[PDB]
Amino acid sequence: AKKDQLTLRGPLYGNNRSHSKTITRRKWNVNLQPCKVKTADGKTTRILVSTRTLRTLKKHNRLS
Amino acid sequence: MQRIKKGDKVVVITGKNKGGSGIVLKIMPARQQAIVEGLNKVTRHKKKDQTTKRAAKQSTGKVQQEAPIFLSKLALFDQKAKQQTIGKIKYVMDPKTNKKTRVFKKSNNTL
RNA sequence: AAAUCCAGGUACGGGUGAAGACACCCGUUAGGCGCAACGGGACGGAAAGACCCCGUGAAGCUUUACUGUAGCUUAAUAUUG
RNA sequence: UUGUGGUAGACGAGCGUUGUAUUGGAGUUGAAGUCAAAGCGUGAGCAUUGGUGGAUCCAAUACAAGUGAGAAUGCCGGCAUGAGUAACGCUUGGGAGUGAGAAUCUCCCAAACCGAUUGACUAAGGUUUCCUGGACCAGGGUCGUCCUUCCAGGGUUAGUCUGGACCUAAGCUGAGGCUGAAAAGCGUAGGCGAUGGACAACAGGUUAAUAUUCCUGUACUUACAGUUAGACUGAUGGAGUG
RNA sequence: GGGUAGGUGGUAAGAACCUCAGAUCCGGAGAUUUCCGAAUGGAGCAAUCCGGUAGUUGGAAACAGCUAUCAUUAAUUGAUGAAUAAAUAGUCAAUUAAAGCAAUACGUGGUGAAGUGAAACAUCUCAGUAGCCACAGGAAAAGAAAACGAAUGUGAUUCCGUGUGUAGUGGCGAGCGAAAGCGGAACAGGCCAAACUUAUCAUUAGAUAGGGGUUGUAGGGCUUGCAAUGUGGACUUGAAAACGAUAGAAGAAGCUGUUGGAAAGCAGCGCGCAAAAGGGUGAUAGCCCCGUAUUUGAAAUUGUUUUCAUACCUAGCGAGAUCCCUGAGUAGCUCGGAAAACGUUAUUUUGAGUGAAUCUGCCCAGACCAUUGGGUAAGCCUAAAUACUAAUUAGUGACCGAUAGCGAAACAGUACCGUGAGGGAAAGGUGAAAAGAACCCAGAGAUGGGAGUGAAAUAGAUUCUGAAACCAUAUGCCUACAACG
Ligand SMILES: [Mg+2]
Ligand SMILES: [Mg+2]
Ligand SMILES: [Mg+2]
Ligand SMILES: [Mg+2]
Ligand SMILES: [Mg+2]
Ligand SMILES: [Mg+2]
Ligand SMILES: [Mg+2]
Ligand SMILES: [Mg+2]
Ligand SMILES: [Mg+2]
Ligand SMILES: [Mg+2]
Ligand SMILES: [Mg+2]
Ligand SMILES: [Mg+2]
Ligand SMILES: [Mg+2]
Ligand SMILES: [Mg+2]
Ligand SMILES: [Mg+2]
Ligand SMILES: [Mg+2]
Ligand SMILES: [Mg+2]
Ligand SMILES: [Mg+2]
Ligand SMILES: [Mg+2]
Ligand SMILES: [Mg+2]
Ligand SMILES: [Mg+2]
Ligand SMILES: [Mg+2]
Ligand SMILES: [Mg+2]
Ligand SMILES: [Mg+2]
Ligand SMILES: [Mg+2]
Ligand SMILES: [Mg+2]
Ligand SMILES: [Mg+2]
Ligand SMILES: [Mg+2]
Ligand SMILES: [Mg+2]
Ligand SMILES: [Mg+2]
Ligand SMILES: [Mg+2]
Ligand SMILES: [Mg+2]
Ligand SMILES: [Mg+2]
Ligand SMILES: [Mg+2]
Ligand SMILES: [Mg+2]
Ligand SMILES: [Mg+2]
Ligand SMILES: [Mg+2]
Ligand SMILES: [Mg+2]
Ligand SMILES: [Mg+2]
Ligand SMILES: [Mg+2]
Ligand SMILES: [Mg+2]
Ligand SMILES: [Mg+2]
Ligand SMILES: [Mg+2]
Ligand SMILES: [Mg+2]
Ligand SMILES: [Mg+2]
Ligand SMILES: [Mg+2]
Ligand SMILES: [Mg+2]
Ligand SMILES: [Mg+2]
Ligand SMILES: [Mg+2]
Ligand SMILES: [Mg+2]
Ligand SMILES: [Mg+2]
């Protein structure tokens, strides 16, 4: 599914309000992007994470 | 235990037959009835049926048998007492044999 | 068996009447009851008119009617040196 | 004294049903129900007697309601009218017999239609409708002693037939895996999937009902073991054929 | 274990047996438990087909009996091991869990309409309802203030009444509608991270296993002393006792006469009661029977509570130092949404982007700033009051009494309808007792008329009572020149 693999954070369902306040259901999807995380110099899996989790990994010196 | 057993003398205290003394030949606990010999004589109109070795003859005319009687209408008959009377019974347990025995309440007669 | 059937013992002419009468008014005619026929009438039977109108009814379709939207396209921003 | 027609409508006073609470009373010497009659009331309504019936019911004062049926092309059940009317959905005569009863059942002789079919073998489906004896509640558009109806008993025999233990087509399922808010969708290896491919039995007879299945006669095929003789054996893979 | 003298389940008579060495029956605990079904050796059109492996018994083997085992996923461990040296991916084996169902009911979360109302309709309402899906539990959820809120104030959460249809929010229209405070039900607060320290990992640890700590009238760590050996838990094992649950035992008191088929009704004379609740017995029984009030009893399983011991957790007030720690892609901010009564806004939440500080710190008191005051976010667990009843036991009803009550009083989700999902009926009463009509007559027989049983046969299996419409028979009256709501 369109969800993170490190965390479980997924899509966010809400309303699409326009002029005249017409209601139409819409879905916000997470910015899923591919990244490779080294683990003890091995198993460089090409995991699919969000950009928020990618920033967390970057500031943690690629720790997960 | 039971008020009426198979064998003891019994009489009827209500109905057309009053003071009818007899011996209980068989007791049905489920239907609360009791077959007593000589009382409640009914005469089924015996037909003729021939489909078996015994049914080839099955000689049955005006056979009078026994009709069952409600156990409530029955009352135990006293024998040990010189002047016999109809009464109710207890369920005392004598420690001599530790077995329950019926004893009348208007006298001291066992069973 | 069947649809039908408010209860019926259910004539014709002129008139009248919710405006075209077996039943009302005035006249005429007609013994009681069947059977075989043919359809004049009973505004005959079957279908809460499909035509018309009404309802701030429904549905299908159309468009430069309104409000939106899938899709398509453009830019900013993140992945992105 | 003035009044008393009346729809929509407003107001007031009452009847009746079921049950509950308090009092009293009746009832196998006959309660409710139910039918009939020549009664009483201003109205809803209320009694008396007799028949039937077989165990509950009544009066008063209050209280609570699933409390009042003529209509809704109202629902359910029964019964009329139409009406003994339309209809009874392609096939004749006679002789003998059974039987309480025969145009309709059994047998026989004809007769009339089918005869690229109303004839015979089977697939699919039907699921005992098949055979024997008995019956005539119901069903049979009439009748019935008779039936594909009902009752009781019985009937379907495979190494070779039709399908599995063999194989695949369309397609289905599908560990991992991919995709997707969830349920799930797609899909690889494998596995299913005939309407196709490969595979050894023919002739006759027999019972009321089964027969390449049972019986007779003559055969064939595939496995395993022992044995004799010969030969080096050669697949989960390659190739040819299929 | 209880309990007896009968039993072999109902339509059900008969045949044949069992049973007083204690049967049938009731209660507790066990044994066996075919096939399908989560179905799980493989398949498949459910209750079928086809197997593998390791044993063991017959055979000369094929083979055939009799046993046990063989699905998938996840976690742990061990072995083996590619591209490619090492190492992973992968493969195999062992152990432990998960699958599914239902209680037409409650809980949480995700997703989420429309009929309708606004007398049209699009904002809005309906409604975060129906439905779909995931996860449970015996309840769930929530929960210990970065809080309410305006005060010499209260001090987790949950539920009930009021505050009130109030403040407010709404094409300011239809409508929607709290949070404080007050009165009640119940009441409980605990524990990690970081400092600091110990031991070990080629100690590059930035990792593992321990001691120390859990905060707001700030807490803890660093150094230095006094007082402590207790009280209490949401807590483990045992032992003992009490109160129960699942069979039971005992359990008082009436005769006579009358109508009647039958007395229990009626009448006379009595009696018992911690029992006058109820059911049956030929009518309407306190004293006929079973029971009820009351007193009692458990071998075995199981529930609650209490006592004792036993683990685990659990402990105060000072001094100095001025040093360290207090939860970061976090709180804020911007762009689109939402939650709260609010139609987006101080507070809460998040899809995209950006991004802080460290007790002289940070957040809050409806934009915002300053003063004052309140509180300590970015970590976790939490009994009670609360929601519901498919089921077990007892009981109740100014609830129903075969068109009513559950669709279903009977063998009802049946017969039947449909390819399927699905839809879905009608039907109860003989008599006290079958004593269910032997026998005669007519008839082929069913059946009818007598006889017989019975109080009643016009109670006869067509079986309580039997209404009307409807169809026939008959006493009496009228009707064939007669226009008829
Ligand atoms: Mg809307
Ligand atoms: Mg008719
Ligand atoms: Mg005129
Ligand atoms: Mg019309
Ligand atoms: Mg319109
Ligand atoms: Mg509309
Ligand atoms: Mg673009
Ligand atoms: Mg008047
Ligand atoms: Mg009354
Ligand atoms: Mg009467
Ligand atoms: Mg009514
Ligand atoms: Mg009719
Ligand atoms: Mg007729
Ligand atoms: Mg006619
Ligand atoms: Mg005719
Ligand atoms: Mg004709
Ligand atoms: Mg014909
Ligand atoms: Mg003919
Ligand atoms: Mg011809
Ligand atoms: Mg043919
Ligand atoms: Mg049949
Ligand atoms: Mg035949
Ligand atoms: Mg025959
Ligand atoms: Mg006939
Ligand atoms: Mg053969
Ligand atoms: Mg196959
Ligand atoms: Mg084939
Ligand atoms: Mg044949
Ligand atoms: Mg025993
Ligand atoms: Mg709407
Ligand atoms: Mg509207
Ligand atoms: Mg409207
Ligand atoms: Mg909880
Ligand atoms: Mg007893
Ligand atoms: Mg007693
Ligand atoms: Mg009584
Ligand atoms: Mg803020
Ligand atoms: Mg809202
Ligand atoms: Mg402060
Ligand atoms: Mg302020
Ligand atoms: Mg903090
Ligand atoms: Mg019913
Ligand atoms: Mg009925
Ligand atoms: Mg069917
Ligand atoms: Mg008779
Ligand atoms: Mg009748
Ligand atoms: Mg009757
Ligand atoms: Mg005359
Ligand atoms: Mg004349
Ligand atoms: Mg005239
Ligand atoms: Mg006249």
From Swiss-Prot, chain A:
Q: Which top-rank group of organisms is this from?
A: Bacteria
Gene3D superfamilies, alphabetized: Ribosomal protein L28/L24
MF term (GO), any: structural constituent of ribosome
Sorted alphabetically, the Gene Ontology BP terms of this entry are: translation
**Keyword terms:** Ribonucleoprotein, Ribosomal protein
Q: Which residues constitute the signal peptide according to the record? A: none
Family, per entry? Belongs to the bacterial ribosomal protein bL28 family.
SUPFAM superfamilies xrefs: L28p-like
* Protein name (record): Large ribosomal subunit protein bL28
Where, by residue number, does the polypeptide cross the bilayer?
Answer: none
- Which residues does the annotated region (Disordered) include? 1-20
Question: What organism does this protein naturally occur in?
Answer: Mycoplasma pneumoniae (strain ATCC 29342 / M129 / Subtype 1) (Mycoplasmoides pneumoniae)
From Swiss-Prot, chain B:
Assembly and partners are described as:
Part of the 50S ribosomal subunit.
- Would you tell me the Gene Ontology cellular component terms? ribonucleoprotein complex; ribosome
Keywords in alphabetical order: Ribonucleoprotein, Ribosomal protein, RNA-binding, rRNA-binding
Q: What is this protein called?
A: Large ribosomal subunit protein uL24
Q: Which CDD domains match?
A: KOW_RPL26 (cd06089)
* Stretches for region Disordered: 43-62
- PANTHER family, per this entry? MITOCHONDRIAL RIBOSOMAL PROTEIN L24
Q: Which family does it belong to?
A: Belongs to the universal ribosomal protein uL24 family.
Q: Which Gene3D superfamilies match?
A: 2.30.30.30
Keyword Repeat in record: no
Mind listing the GO molecular function terms for this protein? Answer: rRNA binding; structural constituent of ribosome
Q: Which SUPFAM superfamilies does the protein's record reference?
A: Translation proteins SH3-like domain
Cite a single Pfam family from the UniProt record: KOW
Q: What does this protein do?
A: One of two assembly initiator proteins, it binds directly to the 5'-end of the 23S rRNA, where it nucleates assembly of the 50S subunit. One of the proteins that surrounds the polypeptide exit tunnel on the outside of the subunit.
Name a biological process GO annotation: translation
**InterPro entries in the cross-refs:** KOW, Rib_uL2_dom2, Ribosomal_uL24, Ribosomal_uL24_CS, Ribosomal_uL24_KOW, Translation_prot_SH3-like_sf
